[PDB]
Each structure stands twice: as structure tokens, then as C-alpha cells.
């Protein structure tokens, strides 16, 4: 009899051939062997149905309610459309319902409130519309509510927050309006609060300090205005994501007392004022994201006292003054991004102490001086952007021994002297841009050993000589931008052997001859 229900369930899966060949009523008669059907060994009744990621494509049959003993349903990853049937509320013993990663739509059914044993309601990543209904506050022992990635509208009723049992509250990426309620502090057993990416307005409640059980608080990418209340200082969260709203005022110095922070994201707001130096008391914080505000003042040297910081992004603010040598202390810094401020002075040499640094971006400042040679000690560097500053001197030869550089951008400075041949040793380099400098001497033929290179731009220097034959070897090069130097000679014909080359620029040199018939003008 339960097999009749299972046959209707199969009869509404669209694209299926050899998928549930197990479900063969001609002769595969013990349905407790069928693919994804699990029975308990006492009653021999269907208790668990798992069909995850088989991509069956149809609908959920109402006959799902004919298996009353079902304790678990997992139909995730099946591109199922249609509505969630009401008869789903007839599985009175259901503990776990995962309908995520499908194309279901319409509202969350009312009958879901009939499932008093339910612990996990997982409907993430579908197309469900409608309210987050109040009936889900009549599921006494519900623990995980994942509704993220649907098109839920309406506000968040403060009734939702009167729940001692709820653990995970995931509402990310819906279209929920309204504010955040003070009653939010009644979720006393919850560790995960996530409303990122809705259309929530209003302020941060000043009573938020009462939510001391939160490990993760995400209210990012809404339109929340106001300031960051002092009582933010009482949370025991590891991750505080406030990025992407309209928060104004200064960063509250009480954030300096939140030593449990693992990840602090205040980025892309309208925060003004200085970076509080007390933030260096975050001796344990691994992430600090203040980029995209209007923070002024200097980089606090106290940021060197955050012993465990791995990702520092202070770019796109109004910061002044010097880059602190103190950042030489941050032994775990993987990524430093100070782009687009008003920093002056030279790169401190002690920055070569950051032995594990992967990305150094200081584009768009007023930095000065020369590339400190101690930089050779940064053998982890993948990405170096000093572009759009006022750097002087010769490109350090040692820059060539930074083995795993793949993006090297020094463009828009006053680099003089000659291209160091050691750059040709960067076998992983993908982009080399040295444009808008005062580089002289000749175009190194050792660029012929830039095997990965995709883009070489040395336009707007004083490069003399011929274009080396050796670039004809570069098999992944798609842009050779050499305009506005004083190159001379004929364009070598081996640039025929540049298959992927699709963008060349040699205008405004003193080249001569006819353009070789190695003309791959695909763009």
C-alpha cells in the first residue's frame, strides 16, 4: 500500500529513465530495497526518503502524505517545480525536511505547522514567494530554519523571535522589508542569525547587546541606517557582518573590547572618523574589513598589535599619513589592501617581515620612495599592485625571484632605469603592466620565457631598440601593448606564432617595414 504512494511519487518526476529502475513493481517487490527508500527494521514501514541530486525534474506528488511514518524527506537537487503540497503536513512523525536546491514556488504551505516533530526545515535556494508565516512559531521543537535564496516578502514578525529552541535562522537573499525588532533578543538558544541581502531598513536595535548566544550575526547588504550602537559591544559573536548598509557615524570604540571577534566586517557603509586605535586590542581577530567608507586619519600603528590578522582591507577610504612599519609584526597577514586613500611616504622595509603575504595592493595613493629591496623576502606574493603612485628608482632585479607572482602592476609611477631581465623568470606571471613610467633601455628578449603570460603592457615609457623575436614563443599572450615608446625596426614575423594574440598596440614608436603577414585580426 505504501508502494502505491511511492508509485504516484514516481509518476510526477519528469525526466527519469534508468533513475529509479529499482522502483519496478513488475518484479522488484520489496520496496525497502528501492533506491533512496529506507525502512525501520521493526515496522518495515517507510521512514526515510532520500533522493538527493538525482535531478528528477517533476513535482512532489501529494502521495508523499500517504507515507505517515516518514521521519525524513530529502529531495534536494532535483530541479523540482510546482508547489509544496499540503499533504506534506500529514507526515506527523517528520523530523527532517530538506527540499533545498529546487525550483519550487508559491507559498510555504499552512499545513507545515501540523508537523510538531519537525527539527530541520530546509527550503533554501528555490523560488518560494509569500510571507515567512507566523504558523512556524507553532512548531515547538524546530531548530534549523533555512529559507535563504527565495523571494519571500513581508516583514519579519517579532513573534518569530519568541523562541528558546531555534538554533539557525537563515533568511538570506529573500526580499524581506521592515526593520529588526528589539524582540530579536528573545532568540536565546540561537547561534546563527542571517538576514543578509534583503531590503531591511531601520536602525540596529540598541538592545542587541542582549543576544549574547549569537556566534554569527549577519545583517549585511540591506539598507540599515543609523549608527552602530554601543551595546554592539556586548555580543559574544565570532563573526560580525554589518557590511553593505547605510550605517553612519564613527566606529564605536567598544568594538575594541570584543576580543572574541574572528571576523569583523564594517565595509561599504558611510562610516566616518578615524579607525579607533583600540582595535589593536583584537589580538585574536583574523579578519578586518573597513574598506569602502569615509574613514579619515592615519592607519593606527596599533594595527600591528593584532597578532593573528590574516586579511586587512582598508582600501577606498580617506586615510592619510604613513604605512606603519608595525604591520611587519602581523606574521599571518595574507592580504593587505590599502588602495585608494591619501597615504604618503615610502613603503616601510619592515613589511618584508610579512613572510606569508599573498596580495599587496596600494594602488591609488601618494606613496613615494623606492621599492624597498628587502622585498625579495616576500616569496609568497601572488599579486603586487603599486600602480598609480609616485614611486621612483629602478625596478629591483630581485623582483624577478618572487616565484609565484602572477599579477605585477607597477603602472603609473616614475620607475626609471631598465626592465630587469629577471622579470622573464616569472613563469607564473599572467599580467605584467609597467605602463606610464620612465623605463628606458631595451625590451628584454627574456620576456620570451613568460610562458603563462597573458598580458604585457609597457606602453608610455622610453623603451628603445627592436621588438625581440622571442615574444613569438609566448603562446598564451593576448595583449601586447607597446605603444608610445621609441621602438624601432621591423615588427618581427614570429608574432605570427602568437595564436591567442588578439590585441596589439605599437603605435607611436619608430617602427618600419610592412606589418608582417602574421595577421591574426580576430578582434
Amino acid at each position: 500500500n505504501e508502494g502505491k504512494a511511492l508509485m504516484a511519487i514516481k509518476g510526477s518526476f519528469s525526466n527519469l529513465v534508468n533513475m529509479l529502475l529499482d522502483w519496478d513493481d513488475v518484479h522488484n517487490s520489496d520496496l525497502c530495497s528501492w533506491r533512496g527508500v529506507f525502512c525501520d527494521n521493526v515496522s518495515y514501514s517507510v521512514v526515510s526518503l532520500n533522493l538527493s541530486s538525482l535531478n528528477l525534474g517533476g513535482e512532489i506528488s501529494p502521495a508523499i502524505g500517504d507515507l505517515r511514518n516518514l521521519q525524513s524527506i530529502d529531495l534536494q537537487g532535483n530541479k523540482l517545480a510546482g508547489q509544496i503540497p499540503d499533504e506534506i503536513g500529514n507526515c506527523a512523525s517528520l523530523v527532517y525536511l530538506d527540499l533545498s536546491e529546487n525550483l519550487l514556488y508559491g507559498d510555504i504551505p499552512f499545513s507545515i505547522s501540523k508537523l510538531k516533530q519537525l527539527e530541520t526545515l530546509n527550503l533554501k535556494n528555490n523560488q518560494l514567494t509569500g510571507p515567512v508565516p507566523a504558523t512556524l512559531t507553532q512548531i515547538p521543537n524546530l531548530k534549523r530554519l533555512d529559507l535563504a535564496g527565495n523571494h519571500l516578502t513581508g516583514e519579519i514578525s517579532r513573534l518569530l523571535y519568541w523562541n528558546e529552541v531555534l538554533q539557525y535562522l537563515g533568511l538570506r537573499g529573500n526580499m524581506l522589508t521592515g526593520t529588526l525588532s528589539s524582540d530579536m533578543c528573545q532568540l536565546t538558544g540561537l547561534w546563527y542569525f542571517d538576514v543578509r541581502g534583503n531590503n531591511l531598513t531601520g536602525t540596529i536595535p540598541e538592545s542587541i547587546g542582549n543576544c549574547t548566544s549569537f556566534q554569527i550575526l549577519d545583517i549585511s547588504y540591506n539598507q540599515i541606517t543609523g549608527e552602530i550602537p554601543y551595546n554592539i559591544g556586548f555580543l559574544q559573536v565570532a563573526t560580525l557582518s554589518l557590511q553593505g548598509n547605510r550605517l553612519t557615524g564613527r566606529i564605536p570604540e567598544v568594538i575594541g573590547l570584543m576580543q572574541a571577534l574572528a571576523v569583523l566586517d564594517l565595509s561599504d557603509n558611510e562610516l566616518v572618523g578615524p579607525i579607533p586605535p583600540i582595535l589593536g586590542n583584537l589580538s585574536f581577530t583574523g579578519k578586518l574589513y573597513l574598506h569602502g567608507n569615509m574613514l579619515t586619519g592615519p592607519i593606527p600603528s596599533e594595527l600591528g598589535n593584532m597578532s593573528r590578522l590574516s586579511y586587512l582591507q582598508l582600501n577606498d577610504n580617506k586615510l592619510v599619513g604613513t604605512i606603519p612599519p608595525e604591520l611587519g609584526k602581523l606574521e599571518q597577514l595574507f592580504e593587505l589592501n590599502l588602495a585608494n586613500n591619501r597615504l604618503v611616504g615610502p613603503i616601510p622595509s619592515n613589511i618584508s617581515s610579512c613572510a606569508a603575504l599573498n596580495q599587496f595592493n596600494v594602488h591609488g595613493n601618494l606613496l613615494s620612495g623606492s621599492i624597498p629591496l628587502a622585498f625579495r623576502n616576500l616569496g609568497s606574493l601572488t599579486y603586487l599592485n603599486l600602480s598609480s603612485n609616485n614611486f621612483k628608482g629602478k625596478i629591483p632585479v630581485e623582483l624577478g625571484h618572487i616565484i609565484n607572482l602572477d599579477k605585477l602592476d607597477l603602472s603609473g609611477n616614475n620607475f626609471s632605469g631598465s626592465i630587469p631581465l629577471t622579470l622573464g623568470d616569472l613563469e607564473h606571471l599572467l599580467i605584467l603592466n609597467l605602463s606610464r613610467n620612465h623605463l628606458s633601455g631595451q625590451l628584454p628578449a627574456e620576456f620570451g620565457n613568460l610562458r603563462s603570460i597573458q598580458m604585457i603592457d609597457v606602453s608610455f615609457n622610453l623603451l628603445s631598440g627592436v621588438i625581440p623575436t622571442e615574444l613569438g614563443q609566448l603562446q598564451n599572450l593576448n595583449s601586447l601593448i607597446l605603444n608610445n615608446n621609441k621602438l624601432h625596426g621591423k615588427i618581427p614575423d614570429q608574432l605570427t606564432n602568437c595564436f591567442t594574440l588578439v590585441n596589439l598596440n605599437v603605435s607611436f614608436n619608430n617602427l618600419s617595414g610592412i606589418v608582417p603577414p602574421m595577421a591574426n585580426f580576430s578582434r
Partner: protein, 367 residues
Amino acid sequence: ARTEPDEQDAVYDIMRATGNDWAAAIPDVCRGRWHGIECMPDQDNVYHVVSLSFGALSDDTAFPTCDPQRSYVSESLTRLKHLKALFFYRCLGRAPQRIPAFLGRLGSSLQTLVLRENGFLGPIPDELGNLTNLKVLDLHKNHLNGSIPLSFNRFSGLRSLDLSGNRLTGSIPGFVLPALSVLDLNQNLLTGPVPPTLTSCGSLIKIDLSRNRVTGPIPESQNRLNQLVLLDLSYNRLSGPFPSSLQGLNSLQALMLKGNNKFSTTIPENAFKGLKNLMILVLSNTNIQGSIPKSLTRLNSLRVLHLEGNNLTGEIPLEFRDVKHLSELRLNDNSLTGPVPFERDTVWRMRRKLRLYNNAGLCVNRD
């Protein structure tokens, strides 16, 4: 910064009573904490225990487990003069015990008390009325019998009361708690009318009384709760009629009367006029008579309308042709008579969530 020694030994006691003796070996409990105890210092740098919790509330962030065979609530809790919350969740002990009376002796400080699914037996001890700073009382899903103690009227600042899933008899409490926000007494054996004192609890945002034996009508005064979001009176023995005005209740998103089999009245047209926020209406299997009124068409937020299993007669209002927002509409098992006004968009979208079967009169055209 060290722990008050007497409180320390109370803590030891409690942890031994629960089966978790590894705590006794811990030198300073408020410094060597485990998830399930919180302390705070006074102005002379003494730590006092302020929260005590047990049980695995889904095991991600579990509290100390209990020996199912031999554990109990320890009288030594009385020595924690500063305990502000106490939490027991699926902690099962030697026998099913009663709730102990001595809990009342923490009246100065206990702000939250949660004894959830512990198989507690017998009546609710009278002396819990002595916890007059309580904001959260929850004794949900035990086996409690008897009456809700009258002394609960001394919870002047209580925020949330959960007594659901027990065998509680007697009447709904007749208290007036001005700040009470959640009242949950569903699935009990409570009897009598809905005391009209209840509508003096203006802070109320949720009333769940479903699955009891409460009789009599809904208080006419019910207009007064401006903040009430959900009201569930399902499966009781209410009698009509519908309160004349519902218009004060402009936060109500849900009203469910389903199962009051002798409710027996009509839905007058001015009952639901102007209920901006009303999203869920369940009047099903309640012996409704008359015609389906037309104001139910102009409820802007209404998504779920259940009216099945009644004596609703007449024709389906033509206004039901222009209702775009409903995801569920149940008029099945009535005696509705005319043609069917539902437009194609509506029938296609709704599918089997629009239900009209077992109506003999109904003149069907296309769906």
C-alpha cells in the same frame, strides 16, 4: 577574581546530582567554565553563578548531559543567591520526578526558568509563584496535572508563559499581566470560558490555547489587543457568535478556530472589514452557517483562507473572481450552490490548493 566558595559547592552538588562529576575536579568553576554556566563579578571581584543550563538542545551547542538512570534536580540550587536563569532540556532522571517546591526559594534573582521535556510529574508546585521577577517561565511538554496555580498572578513582569503539552486541568488563569507577550497553553485539558481578564493583557502578541476544552465565546473585548499577531483557539468547544467588531486587532496575521465543532453562527460582513494585516483565516469544521461574506475578498494580506466542512450556503461571491494573492482557499465539503467565478489565472496558479469538491449545488464550467 574567584568564585564565592558556597556557590562553588552548590555548583558541585548540582553537577553531581545530574551525573557530571568531572566538575568537582575543576578548581574554579566560574573561571574554568563549560558551555552551560555563566558567572558575573560583584564590585569586590567575587564571581557569582548567574545562569545554569543542561541538556542537549540539538547537540551543536550542547549542555551537560544527564545520567538517564540516576539524576535529579538538586536542592543545592537554593544556595545560588544570584541565579538569573535555569534551563533543563530533555534531561531525564532516576524516576520521573515532580517539579521541586524549593525552586521558589530563588525569588530575588530568578529571571528565566525553562524546564522543557523532562517528564515532570504531578502538580505545578504552588511556591513557584514566589518567583516574582520571572520574565520567562516554560514547563512545556511534561506530564503535569492539576491546575495552573493561582499564585501565577504575582508574576507582574513575566514576558512569556509556556505550559503547553501537559495534562493541566481547571481554567485559563485569570491574571492580568501587563507585560505578558506570549501565552501558550495548547494541548492541555483546560476548561471554562475565556476569562475576559485576558484582554487586559495588552502586551499580548500570541495566544495559543488550541487543543483544550475551553468553552464559551470569544471575548467581545478582544478588540483591545493591538499587538496580537497570532491567535489559535482550534479544537476547543467554543460557541458563537463572532465578536461584532474585530477592527481593533490590526496586527493579527493569523486566526485559527478550526475544530470548534459546535461554534455554529454566521460570518457577518462587518466582522472582517479593515484587517489590513490578516494573512491566515482558518474557520474550518466549525459549523459555520450563512453565506460566505464579501469583505473576505478585500483583505489585502490574506493568503490562506480555510472555510471547509461547514454549512456555508449560497453562491460563491463574484468578488472571489478578483483575488490574486491567496495561495490556499478551501470551500470544499459545504453546500454552495451557484456557478464558479474563479478566473483562469487563478485556477491555473492555485491548482489543487483551491478546493471546491463536495458541494452538490456547484455549477462547474472549466476547472
